[PDB]
């Protein structure tokens, strides 16, 4: 059965703004991307699915348990031990007053590692995995560049080996070369592991490079379920064609 | 009973509320039990939370021992002892052995605390993570969520910033295996003394109005890492009076040019050793 | 901050004995009783009652006697003594319309229904020192008139029935209690008034004077000053009906301030409010003026004077806090200064070799 | 409608003077076995004022308030609440409150205790009002 | 119609509080409240002393039907001025006998995740608290282990031994019998043994 | 037709009569003397002397008695009396080094020459009302020690000779006198100090407390 | 002590400091420090002001009669 099931999730804090009648199934090892305009509400959907925003109506199932039926402690633990979140701004997801090694090992300490040497070794290993130099582990995110900060955030999220990671356009604000290298690293990590990835992006290039299946959201409703190299090259819905033409 | 005043200087309503809070705290070790008392002005800074607890729990038959940084000769300790002599008339002693109530500021006595004793600690701040979390709304809930890893961050980065754990005062602990409590700014030397103590320890913060207690024989363990276990640096300098170096040593300044000496903080244990 | 100090018990006790012997003064003279102080130094007792927070004449006079006439120390003593008392009840809201007037004036009209009742007041006296008070004498006989009080409606009722001002309506909001929870700024007007009633008279006087001179002007008019006895009532749980427990002598000041032009309401006057124990009225007038000044966020007028600054005005009006701060600086800080000495000396070496 | 009369005589007792009340009660030579169920306690009463005299409530300090309770032999409870710290005065007021609820003492004490005290207080209030109204400022007078 | 409270409220309340603190901080210990010489029947001396020393206007009391009484309610409302409720849900100091129903106990407030001290404090009167099923106590407040054999109904025995409310949530039991009292907080590891 | 009549002078005279009756208070009590206020309300006298501008304890006590304890009213009484008197002379600048010390303390140095001397003070006292003062009594017999006073040079003299402070040296400048001419901002330090010594103590205490922030 | 602290605060201009708070504002502090002036000019509101207030009343009545009717 699909790892994550979404059924009739709707939330409209303001008229038009938000999302409605959103449903989809996500299986492990598959990357599901979301494409839409600024007002499509895809960010609201990402917040709602990641145990942050309570939907007005709908049901989200993880494994066999409803997402929002669980207690606050259960969802808080899930957001740190088995789920990952990569915000667009690394500082939002990174603790500024904590070194890179400290940020990486915060999840392990929360799990109850209680071992400075093992925590530091794991932090160095993850920094090497995300290409960050290990010599500057004691350094802090403020001194790291945008790409390095994004890599540190990815390492922090993946230190717990989560089976589901949401990514609210981490590539925003990065150069073309840096963005491409980061996307390649993300694809390598995804293929190496069996964790599902939900990527929200405002451009089709990121979905083409990383995402496996694609969905389109317009004015807060799903328009047409997509697939890599099919919607991008053979858009069916007129709005999808308009988006493709605008991108091109 | 001081003329014109209630016994122990506190109105019976504040006493009753603090007593109820103390009982709740005992039933929930390590939890900072709120109490909604009034605002009371006091001359000496120490007392906003310690004097209140002492007044709530002190009786006519108690023997009171007031301690400031381990010493009974301190001006504030003498003032508080005299205040309680005036408003309660209780007996006061210089010995941890003969005391039944020990009001202390930032120090556990060297002498082991026996049964039928209560030790009260003034707590300037009752929640250690106030230095990290500004908003208290998440602070209350994270205790139930058990998210005590955040306070581990300062311990982790202390060695990075200094090469060793320098948090020798107000070192956080986990009591009953559940609740992370921060005692008064007692030294690291005294943190071990809190492990399954025979006596009932009470902690009271006034400026925040939170009470937490450690029932006797309650397991409290220092928060640290397995790779960096909680260790107390052994003292390699003696006391200028009795010589013994088995007790935490404080510094007393003798001149205006910086000259000073080390003497046992717990003057009672110092006198016990000297008279030996 | 907090320097632990040892070895002064004997000296401290001797100093306290000296202070008490000086408070008693020369034993040839009689001992200044508390009834004498409350009867004959009534205005000092008014100020101490208002600032300390207990409307008991005898307690305030006792605190004044203990403090050797010092008002700040007496206020400290009374405020501390307030801690040992149990809150037995909360009174019904005072109805100043029922006040038994000892004095009532209005500066906004030449005459008003009820009359300009001067009452006891030092106003219009020529401040020439009276040396006959250096010996005993006899108080003047009090000329009598009609032993009746005419209807004395509040002048603001008259102004509001004309539409020139707004009635202060009761929204039912629960008053804030600083005596239970420390203030958080910005604080509601009830909290502001509670803190103003407890503020130092000589500091709120200066803030009101600054507003008058143009540091946050509010165009004040003494719309009404009243001084008289008001019945206090409670509703005990044992019973179910309101009982009258006595009367308090209090002074109420209603200021008429500059008019505004609301977007969708006729122009009207604003108003400050002051309320104090006893007949010390300059405190009530300063309270009303600073109340109007601190109403700036309510009226959406940006502050241009220190008296319009809420944090500055309220965070330092308390005598106890400022007195404790100043007293701490006296305490032995031998160690802390030694730290400063080393810090200063290094700067001297670095900038001067 | 005994609530209004009880309020009246309770207020007359509270507003009385301890000297006046004590002297008159001693003169009455009236006493019945009573027990102080509540010992006379002096605490605080919080003063509640109104903004502008008619607006929202705010707190205007505290006053001293003494309260006592007495139970008579038959079980009638008399309470007192008097501003100040005179505990014997509060006990006397509670005793009179209890007695006034007994049919034997209601009319007798109203004629001999409560009405005279109210009259004396009114007399001194009227005298003070005369002295105060001597200070009135006159501007205009009707002329025929 | 009214019952006399502590002869000396201040010192008697302080002594009762110290005895209750000894009982609570050391679960299983038996302490005697010699202060009050006569309880408010059907309440025993221990329950009356606890209510007098702890109950006030901020502590609603829920007397159970067998223990609820007009004289008891009047005396409690007079001496302590504490509000009186009739449903266990809103109680803060619940009082019940060995006939306590399982539903009544389950309705008692146990606290909250953010306010674990906001729950009720059940007080239980028993015929005796020394003769009954053997019970071993350990945990916070216990030196090594204490043996108590009090006469509890099956419902509260199940609650103690199989506490369904996770720490810090849970009520704090107070056994009472005549002058003698015993305290079992929510943190006591209690087993049948 | 509401003919205007005169009631002003007869109003203020009656008001002042009522005020003096209130001042005398209950007549069954002895009228408190100026000497009693001077000897026992000595801190009120000190404040009135400092703010009123005349260092005359009897005059300050008289002002307090005439003001019904109102410190501001007594201060203004003494200030108005200042205008009555003529300036007979100007003293030589005061020498505080030759003080006969009732009290001498320092918070920076422990071993100050001349020794620390707490003297009469309210410091370290418990703010507990002494209800025994509701009745007559007498203060405890004073303890005695050595009767000699050692020389007591200023602490700032030590700080200056150590290079940590600057010695305040007189340049011979003529002090400003606000009592002769109105203040003209900006003011010299002499004018500021003269004004401050006359400043209300509550206002200055609040300003000092605000400088902490 | 309060006089010493306020004197040091008012020494700002000669130390080349910037007034951060009213206490260091020379004119505000000194103009209102005098007890007699502040007390007199606050208590003077008890003086009749019906001539001045009548001028205010006339303007407000004219403003009310034009804002609405
Ligand atoms: Zn030693
Ligand atoms: Zn300090
Ligand atoms: Zn004017």
PDB file of N, CA, C and O in Angstrom, chain A residues 29 31 182-192 209-212:
ATOM      1  N   UNK A  29      10.428   5.080  -2.286  1.00  0.00           N
ATOM      2  CA  UNK A  29      11.360   5.105  -3.393  1.00  0.00           C
ATOM      3  C   UNK A  29      10.925   5.934  -4.581  1.00  0.00           C
ATOM      4  O   UNK A  29      11.644   5.963  -5.588  1.00  0.00           O
ATOM      5  N   UNK A  31       9.683   9.766  -6.078  1.00  0.00           N
ATOM      6  CA  UNK A  31       9.733  11.203  -5.836  1.00  0.00           C
ATOM      7  C   UNK A  31       8.523  11.837  -6.508  1.00  0.00           C
ATOM      8  O   UNK A  31       8.335  11.704  -7.723  1.00  0.00           O
ATOM      9  N   UNK A 182      23.599  20.613  -6.732  1.00  0.00           N
ATOM     10  CA  UNK A 182      22.778  20.224  -5.591  1.00  0.00           C
ATOM     11  C   UNK A 182      21.702  19.229  -6.003  1.00  0.00           C
ATOM     12  O   UNK A 182      21.428  18.266  -5.280  1.00  0.00           O
ATOM     13  N   UNK A 183      21.075  19.448  -7.161  1.00  0.00           N
ATOM     14  CA  UNK A 183      20.064  18.509  -7.640  1.00  0.00           C
ATOM     15  C   UNK A 183      20.679  17.148  -7.942  1.00  0.00           C
ATOM     16  O   UNK A 183      20.071  16.109  -7.662  1.00  0.00           O
ATOM     17  N   UNK A 184      21.881  17.133  -8.521  1.00  0.00           N
ATOM     18  CA  UNK A 184      22.558  15.865  -8.775  1.00  0.00           C
ATOM     19  C   UNK A 184      22.858  15.138  -7.469  1.00  0.00           C
ATOM     20  O   UNK A 184      22.670  13.919  -7.368  1.00  0.00           O
ATOM     21  N   UNK A 185      23.329  15.870  -6.457  1.00  0.00           N
ATOM     22  CA  UNK A 185      23.591  15.256  -5.159  1.00  0.00           C
ATOM     23  C   UNK A 185      22.308  14.709  -4.544  1.00  0.00           C
ATOM     24  O   UNK A 185      22.300  13.613  -3.967  1.00  0.00           O
ATOM     25  N   UNK A 186      21.212  15.464  -4.652  1.00  0.00           N
ATOM     26  CA  UNK A 186      19.935  15.000  -4.123  1.00  0.00           C
ATOM     27  C   UNK A 186      19.477  13.732  -4.831  1.00  0.00           C
ATOM     28  O   UNK A 186      18.992  12.795  -4.189  1.00  0.00           O
ATOM     29  N   UNK A 187      19.616  13.688  -6.157  1.00  0.00           N
ATOM     30  CA  UNK A 187      19.235  12.492  -6.900  1.00  0.00           C
ATOM     31  C   UNK A 187      20.092  11.302  -6.494  1.00  0.00           C
ATOM     32  O   UNK A 187      19.586  10.183  -6.346  1.00  0.00           O
ATOM     33  N   UNK A 188      21.397  11.523  -6.315  1.00  0.00           N
ATOM     34  CA  UNK A 188      22.260  10.447  -5.859  1.00  0.00           C
ATOM     35  C   UNK A 188      21.852   9.919  -4.498  1.00  0.00           C
ATOM     36  O   UNK A 188      21.801   8.705  -4.279  1.00  0.00           O
ATOM     37  N   UNK A 189      21.548  10.823  -3.565  1.00  0.00           N
ATOM     38  CA  UNK A 189      21.098  10.397  -2.245  1.00  0.00           C
ATOM     39  C   UNK A 189      19.785   9.629  -2.333  1.00  0.00           C
ATOM     40  O   UNK A 189      19.602   8.613  -1.652  1.00  0.00           O
ATOM     41  N   UNK A 190      18.856  10.100  -3.168  1.00  0.00           N
ATOM     42  CA  UNK A 190      17.561   9.438  -3.291  1.00  0.00           C
ATOM     43  C   UNK A 190      17.728   8.031  -3.848  1.00  0.00           C
ATOM     44  O   UNK A 190      17.120   7.076  -3.349  1.00  0.00           O
ATOM     45  N   UNK A 191      18.546   7.876  -4.891  1.00  0.00           N
ATOM     46  CA  UNK A 191      18.728   6.552  -5.481  1.00  0.00           C
ATOM     47  C   UNK A 191      19.470   5.635  -4.515  1.00  0.00           C
ATOM     48  O   UNK A 191      19.181   4.436  -4.434  1.00  0.00           O
ATOM     49  N   UNK A 192      20.436   6.179  -3.769  1.00  0.00           N
ATOM     50  CA  UNK A 192      21.186   5.352  -2.830  1.00  0.00           C
ATOM     51  C   UNK A 192      20.291   4.810  -1.721  1.00  0.00           C
ATOM     52  O   UNK A 192      20.433   3.646  -1.330  1.00  0.00           O
ATOM     53  N   UNK A 209      14.811  17.161 -13.438  1.00  0.00           N
ATOM     54  CA  UNK A 209      16.111  16.634 -13.036  1.00  0.00           C
ATOM     55  C   UNK A 209      15.986  15.644 -11.884  1.00  0.00           C
ATOM     56  O   UNK A 209      16.689  14.626 -11.857  1.00  0.00           O
ATOM     57  N   UNK A 210      15.101  15.916 -10.925  1.00  0.00           N
ATOM     58  CA  UNK A 210      15.011  15.132  -9.699  1.00  0.00           C
ATOM     59  C   UNK A 210      13.728  14.320  -9.595  1.00  0.00           C
ATOM     60  O   UNK A 210      13.780  13.115  -9.334  1.00  0.00           O
ATOM     61  N   UNK A 211      12.572  14.949  -9.792  1.00  0.00           N
ATOM     62  CA  UNK A 211      11.305  14.275  -9.548  1.00  0.00           C
ATOM     63  C   UNK A 211      11.101  13.117 -10.521  1.00  0.00           C
ATOM     64  O   UNK A 211      11.617  13.117 -11.641  1.00  0.00           O
ATOM     65  N   UNK A 212      10.343  12.119 -10.067  1.00  0.00           N
ATOM     66  CA  UNK A 212       9.969  10.965 -10.878  1.00  0.00           C
ATOM     67  C   UNK A 212       8.539  11.067 -11.393  1.00  0.00           C
ATOM     68  O   UNK A 212       8.287  10.840 -12.580  1.00  0.00           O
TER      69      UNK A 212
END
